[PDB]
Structures are given as structure tokens and as C-alpha cells.
Amino acid sequence: TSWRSEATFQFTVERFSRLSESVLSPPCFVRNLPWKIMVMPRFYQKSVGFFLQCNAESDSTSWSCHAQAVLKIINYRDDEKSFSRRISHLFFHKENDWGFSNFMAWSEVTDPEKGFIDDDKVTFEVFVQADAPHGVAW
Amino acid sequence: SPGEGPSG
């Protein structure tokens, strides 16, 4: 159920090579809160920005939830070549997302020989393990 | 660096 303490969810970004604005997945409910994948191009050389967002729409300022997560870009040819990074973060209203602005090089993820992109689609996955929240279910 | 942190 939505009260579960962990879940894995995926979001496939289409027309990936043409991405310009941040894109957001539908919510996955864990600890009864909505978690989402956020992806955007970033520049510093171009990189994939990949973030996990928690409970961002709520106007509450009382809530918090600590979670650990694995953020993964799927390699569709060989899951052993999928690329992942781990985070731990206390999510709350003023810091409702966390991840990596330079998760991977854009030129690598979009390289058709590497196995992450197919039909201009790239799939992102999050495994999130969340603690019981505070300041929500009183 | 992988740029760990918030999106904004």
C-alpha cells in the first residue's frame, strides 16, 4: 500500500536528445507521500541532472521525511552497465529534492553505442527507502 | 564532481 516504507519506480523520458526544460514523473507513494523523478539538462560540458523530489506540491511547512535512495539510469542492453549513485537526505518544504546536477555526461547517455538510449528514450529509476515522516500524519 | 545537492 501507499504506507510502504520503500519502493522502486521508473520514468522514461522521451525525445531525450531534445530535452530543454526540467521534466517530472508521476508520483510514487512511499510513506503516503508523493515521490517523483526530476530530470533536466545541466551545464558547467553538458550533463544529466537527476533528482528525487518529495512532497513538493504541499503547502505544509511542518513535514519532514528522511530517506536513502539509489538513483539509476537503466542500460537497456545490459543491466550490469546501468549507472547508479546513492543519496541520503532529510526532505522538507525548503529542501524538497536531492540528487546530482552532474549525474552523468550528456554525451555518454545519448551515445547510441552505449546502451542507455533507444528511440530517443532514456529510463530513470529510483529505489527509495524512507523513514516514517514527521509533521504529516499527526 | 557529480554535483550532489538540490536542483536549485
Short-list A3, A63, A61, A9, CA closest to A35? A9
- Give the C-alpha separation, A56 to A37, whole Å: 12
Q: In what order do the strands lie in the sheet with A122-130?
A: A6-13, A122-130, A64-73, A83-92
Domains and their CATH numbers in chain A: 1-138 (2.60.210.10)
Length of chain A: 138
Structure solved via: X-ray
b (16+ CB within 10 A) / e for A52-73: bbbbbeeeeeebbbebebebbb
Residue type, A76: Y
Q: Which of A70, A88, A101 to mutate to test the interface with B (most CBs of B within 10 A)?
A: A101
DSSP 8-state secondary structure symbol assigned to residue A25: P
- Tell me how close the Cα of A5 comes to any Cα of chain B, in angstroms: 23
Q: Which residues contact A59 (CB under 8 A, 6 or more apart)?
A: none
Interchain contact, B7 vs A102, CB within 8 Å:
no
Q: Does A42 touch chain B (CB under 8 A)?
A: yes
First to last CA, chain A: 19
Q: What is the resolution of this structure in A?
A: 1.0
**Nearest by CB: B7 against A38, A85, A102:** A38
How many C-beta neighbours within 10 Å does residue A20 have?
8
Short-list B6, B8, B2, B7, CA closest to A102? B2
